[PDB]
Amino acid sequence: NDCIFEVKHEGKVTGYACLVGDKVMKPAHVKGTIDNADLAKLAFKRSSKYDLECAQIPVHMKSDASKFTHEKPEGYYNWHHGAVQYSGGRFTIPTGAGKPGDSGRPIFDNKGRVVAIVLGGANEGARTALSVVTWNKDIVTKITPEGAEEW
């Protein structure tokens, strides 16, 4: 728990919240409470449009936040469970690398810069196209491939 924190609901980890820039971010559909009391007590706003819940990072934690970038060249990226391909405007991963529970994990570049947050994914056989919140032309956007389930 430095920039990524478990969200828990009735004992079970249902997802993750992430510190990015000056925001605390969590997928809105992820049920439960962030298992950090400094975070859990913040003013959070829900946006259905982005499936995001956000709060201002507290003063004593601002410097723990992840760096981010709007720039995502086509290629491969990182998340907790391995490689993530970006091409065609879609993020994809090996099917099974991700499952219900991974919602909230960030996708980041080689310099540790967050480029997207994972919301869920659509099984397309061998690969899974991720549902994500990200920046397109520096504008916040939720991208959902057809047939995606919330994670």
Among 8, 23, 29, 80, which residue sits at the site for ligand BOG (rule: CB under 6 A)?
Answer: 80
Instruction: From the candidates 35, 60, 70, 103, give the one annotated as an active-site residue.
Output: 103
Catalytic annotation present for 51: yes
Q: Does 74 bind ligand BOG (CB under 6 A)?
A: no
Instruction: Give one word for 14, left, alpha or beta, with left for phi > 0 and alpha for psi -120 to 50.
Output: alpha
Q: One of 51, 102, 109, 131 is an active-site residue; which one?
A: 51
97 scored as a contact of ligand BOG (CB under 6 A): no
Q: Does 8 bind ligand BOG (CB under 6 A)?
A: no
Q: Are 130 and 83 in contact (CB under 8 A)?
A: no
Q: How many CA atoms lie within 13 A of 62 on its CB side?
A: 5
- Which of ligand BOG, its own copies, none has residue 80 at its interface (CB below 5 to 8 Å by kind)? ligand BOG
Nearer to its own copies, 8 or 113 (CB): 113
Question: By the criterion CB under 8 A, which residues form the site for its own copies?
Answer: 73-78, 82-85, 108-112
Nearer to its own copies, 66 or 85 (CB): 85
63 binds ligand BOG (CB under 6 A): no
80 is catalytic: no
Q: Taking a C-beta distance cutoff of 8 angstroms, is the pair 95, 126 a contact?
A: yes
Catalytic annotation present for 60: no
Residues annotated as catalytic (active site), given as ranges:
29, 51, 103
Q: Which residues bind ligand BOG (CB under 6 A)?
A: 1-4, 80
